[PDB]
Structures are given as C-alpha cells and as structure tokens.
Scaffold this active site. Structure first.
Site, mmCIF file in Angstrom:
data_model
loop_
_atom_site.group_PDB
_atom_site.id
_atom_site.type_symbol
_atom_site.label_atom_id
_atom_site.label_comp_id
_atom_site.label_asym_id
_atom_site.label_seq_id
_atom_site.Cartn_x
_atom_site.Cartn_y
_atom_site.Cartn_z
ATOM 1 N N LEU A 86 0.662 -1.094 0.152
ATOM 2 C CA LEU A 86 -0.017 -0.052 0.001
ATOM 3 C C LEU A 86 0.752 1.172 -0.386
ATOM 4 C CD1 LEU A 86 -1.940 -1.963 -0.153
ATOM 5 C CD2 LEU A 86 -3.092 -1.253 1.651
ATOM 6 N N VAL A 115 1.931 2.767 3.194
ATOM 7 C CA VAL A 115 2.500 1.830 3.876
ATOM 8 C C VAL A 115 3.787 1.680 3.869
ATOM 9 C CG1 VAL A 115 0.127 1.262 4.577
ATOM 10 C CG2 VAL A 115 1.916 -0.544 4.124
ATOM 11 N N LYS A 142 5.159 -2.897 12.482
ATOM 12 C CA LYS A 142 3.984 -2.740 13.549
ATOM 13 C C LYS A 142 3.130 -3.729 13.419
ATOM 14 C CE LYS A 142 6.044 0.995 14.139
ATOM 15 N NZ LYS A 142 6.918 2.310 14.690
ATOM 16 N N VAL A 149 -9.516 19.293 29.425
ATOM 17 C CA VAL A 149 -10.216 20.693 29.844
ATOM 18 C C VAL A 149 -10.586 21.568 28.952
ATOM 19 C CG1 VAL A 149 -9.655 22.607 31.257
ATOM 20 C CG2 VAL A 149 -8.964 20.313 32.172
ATOM 21 N N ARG A 202 -23.732 14.766 28.774
ATOM 22 C CA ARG A 202 -24.571 14.985 27.596
ATOM 23 C C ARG A 202 -25.720 15.618 28.005
ATOM 24 N NH1 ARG A 202 -22.842 14.157 22.582
ATOM 25 N NH2 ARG A 202 -25.132 14.135 22.298
ATOM 26 N N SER A 205 -27.505 18.043 15.950
ATOM 27 C CA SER A 205 -28.088 16.662 16.543
ATOM 28 C C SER A 205 -29.424 16.793 17.250
ATOM 29 C CB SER A 205 -27.316 15.920 17.253
ATOM 30 O OG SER A 205 -26.830 16.612 18.378
ATOM 31 N N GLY A 210 -24.431 17.563 22.791
ATOM 32 C CA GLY A 210 -23.461 17.897 23.729
ATOM 33 C C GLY A 210 -23.239 19.497 24.330
ATOM 34 N N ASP A 211 -23.569 20.334 23.228
ATOM 35 C CA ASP A 211 -23.595 21.693 23.354
ATOM 36 C C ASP A 211 -24.674 22.258 22.630
ATOM 37 O OD1 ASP A 211 -21.841 20.632 21.316
ATOM 38 O OD2 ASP A 211 -21.120 22.617 21.007
ATOM 39 N N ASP A 264 -23.109 27.879 21.839
ATOM 40 C CA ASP A 264 -22.496 28.689 20.921
ATOM 41 C C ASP A 264 -23.462 29.513 19.849
ATOM 42 O OD1 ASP A 264 -19.654 27.594 21.706
ATOM 43 O OD2 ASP A 264 -19.985 26.112 19.840
HETATM 44 MN MN LIG Z 1 -23.562 20.253 18.840
HETATM 45 NA NA NA Z 2 -9.255 20.844 25.777
HETATM 46 NA NA NA Z 3 4.461 1.169 -0.346
#
Ligand SMILES: [Mn+2]
Ligand code: NA
Ligand code: NA
Length: 327
Positions: free
Chosen positions: A54, A57, A64, A95, A141, A172, A181-182, A248
DNA sequence: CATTAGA
DNA sequence: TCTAATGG
C-alpha cells in the site's frame, strides 16, 4: 469497517499519540494516511508485506502490523498506555481550553492532576478557568428534554429583543437526537447580509439579553460574529439545579443562513452525500452558498436561497427532514 | 477553515 | 504579529 479494525485502530492509537504527547506532526500524519488506506482495503490484511504494498504503507507501520497480527498487542502501544507522562497529557487536554501544547507545558511544570490544576488556577487563563470550573458539567450529555427548554428560552429573548431575528438551534438536536453535547444556535438578521457592513451589535444585543435573564452565565469568547459560552437552566423550585452547558451562537448574513443552516445540521455524512450529489447535478455547495457549476472546470455565481428547500430543489432532491438527515 | 484570546 | 484552541 470491521475486517481491518484492530489495524486502523492501533493505527490511530499511534498517530494520535505522536501528535499529542509528541510534536511529531509528520509521524502523526503518517499513521493516519496508513490507517486511512488499510481502512479502505477490501481484504483481511494478513501480514505486513501484504499491507506494505500500500501507498502510505511503509516498513515501519508494516512492521508494527506484524507484531500486532502475531500477538494481540503492541509494546509501544503497551508502553504509552502505561506512561504516566503521556497518560497525563491525554487527560489535561480534556479541560476546555487546554490544548496539547499547553497540556504538555503544565505537565512540565508538574501539573498532572485536576487538583494540580486547581492549586494553580493562576497559571490558567479565563477559558481554562471556566473550563476547569465546569469540568464535570462539561463532560455530560444534554437530555433533549432540557434541549427543548433551552431552545424555548433562547427563542423568546431573541424575538423579545428584535422581532426581526431568525434563529435556529442546529446540530443533532435539530436532527432528532435524544441527547446533545453543546447547543448551537445559528443566528441571522435581515439587516445583515453578505454586503451590508456589519452590525456587531446585532450579535451583542442578544448575548446581553440572554445574560440579562441569567441564561448565559459566562463568556468563553465573544467576538463580533461568534459568541462562545456557558448556560444553565434556572434551577426550579429547588432540590435539583441544572448543569452548566456549553453554548455557541453565531451571527450570519441572512443571504447565507439556509446553506449554513443546512450544513451545521449535517449529518456529517448526509452533508457530504448531499454535497457529492449537487456536483453531478451541476453544482457546488459549501457552508455558505451553492454556485452553479461551469464546464471550464469551475464556475461561480451564488444562487438565491430562501429555505432549506431551495437548496434541495436546486440540486433537484427530495426534501429531507432533519429527522432523516442521518446520511 | 475560520474565528477569538493572548502575549 | 503569530500561535493556540474550538468547532464544525
Ligand atoms: Mn453540537
Ligand atoms: Na481541551
Ligand atoms: Na508502499
């Protein structure tokens, strides 16, 4: 989607870690394309080599892959998961306000814990202060139940101040979602569009009002076009107080509401898909408009939008309720 | 990908 | 000014 799961998964575990704990933008950038491709690959990767073929890749990742295919683990990953220093950056970051750079620097000084953050509230700026302040409420939430009351209130003041205001709580919640969420309100006004050199106040007036009544408790950032804060629902006839929520609000030149409105509503997929379609249908759609496509390769000339519909009709589609904007 | 804080 | 952090 599942065949190459652990792969892309460890892939991302890795990439992320470069970019955060380290400042290896590239390696970080590497693990991602790789994780990006192997993700698309139609067959069970059986070994590095197979993988290797790939694009993206290389020998490292490939390497790995084996270790992981052989043993259901990875040391590097096992080490990083352990590493406190790195555990630390991962955490501080949560935070609101704390980015990686900052996550690291704190650590540096030895701020690892939440409490650490406390004993040094000084080293923190407003954003992070509030961020650290509402750490709990920020992670929770938003029950639609609440989503509805909030929306209610916002609607009212907006209308209360000027009646000409048009507001839509997008996202949403807009698409039915039991929880959010907000909250994201898209704002606009007639007096403000593409040309008409602003009316910063436009945004201001509202913010002020929401504050007036005690809906917005704090300001994370407010500009002449995008406010960013915290709110809370009036804690009733007591025993149960509401949680501090992120909110917001953005001003929008009325001649670009719906697109944007379209947009923020998503879903991420519905958008793209819709997006991919207007393309064939001789168009172009972006967070602000929809320009008829020209054969020379490209073209401009922003079409006239009056509702979510216009856009639909444009590309000649079936109006989809937000409910069903799922993809 | 663009808007705000800050230093 | 640049540089970080958010969102989306
Ligand atoms: Mn939102
Ligand atoms: Na943050
Ligand atoms: Na490759």
């Amino acid at each position: 989607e599942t065949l190459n799961g652990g792969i892309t998964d460890m892939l991302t575990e890795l990439a992320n870690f470069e970019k955060n704990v380290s400042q290896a933008i590239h390696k970080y950038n590497a693990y991602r394309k790789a994780a990006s491709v192997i993700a698309k690959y139609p067959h069970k990767i059986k070994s590095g080599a197979e993988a290797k073929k790939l694009p993206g890749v290389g020998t490292k990742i490939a390497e790995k892959i084996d270790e992981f295919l052989a043993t259901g683990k990875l040391r590097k990953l096992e080490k990083i998961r352990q590493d406190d220093t790195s555990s630390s950056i991962n955490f501080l970051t949560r935070v609101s306000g704390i980015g990686p750079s900052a996550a690291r620097k704190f650590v540096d000084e030895g701020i690892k814990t939440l409490e650490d953050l406390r004993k040094n509230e000084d080293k923190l700026n407003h954003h992070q202060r509030i961020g650290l302040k509402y750490f709990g409420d920020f992670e929770k939430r938003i029950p639609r139940e609440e989503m509805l009351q909030m929306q209610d209130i916002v609607l009212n003041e907006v209308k209360k101040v000027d009646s000409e205001y048009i507001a839509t709580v997008c996202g949403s919640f807009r698409r039915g979602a039991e929880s959010s969420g907000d909250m994201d309100v898209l704002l606009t006004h007639p007096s403000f569009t593409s040309e008409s050199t602003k009316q910063p106040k436009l945004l201001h007036q509202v913010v002020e009002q929401l504050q007036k009544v005690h809906f917005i408790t704090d300001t994370l950032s407010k500009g002449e076009t995008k406010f960013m804060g915290v709110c809370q629902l009036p804690s009733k006839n007591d025993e149960k107080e509401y949680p501090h929520r992120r909110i917001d609000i953005r001003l929008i030149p009325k001649d670009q509401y719906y697109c944007g409105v379209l947009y923020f509503t998503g879903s991420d997929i519905f958008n793209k898909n819709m997006r991919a379609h207007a393309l064939e249908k001789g168009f172009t759609i972006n967070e602000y408009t929809i320009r008829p496509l020209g054969v020379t390769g490209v073209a401009g000339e922003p079409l006239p939008v009056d509702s979510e519909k216009d856009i639909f009709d444009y590309i000649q589609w079936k109006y989809r309720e937000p409910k069903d904007r799922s993809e």
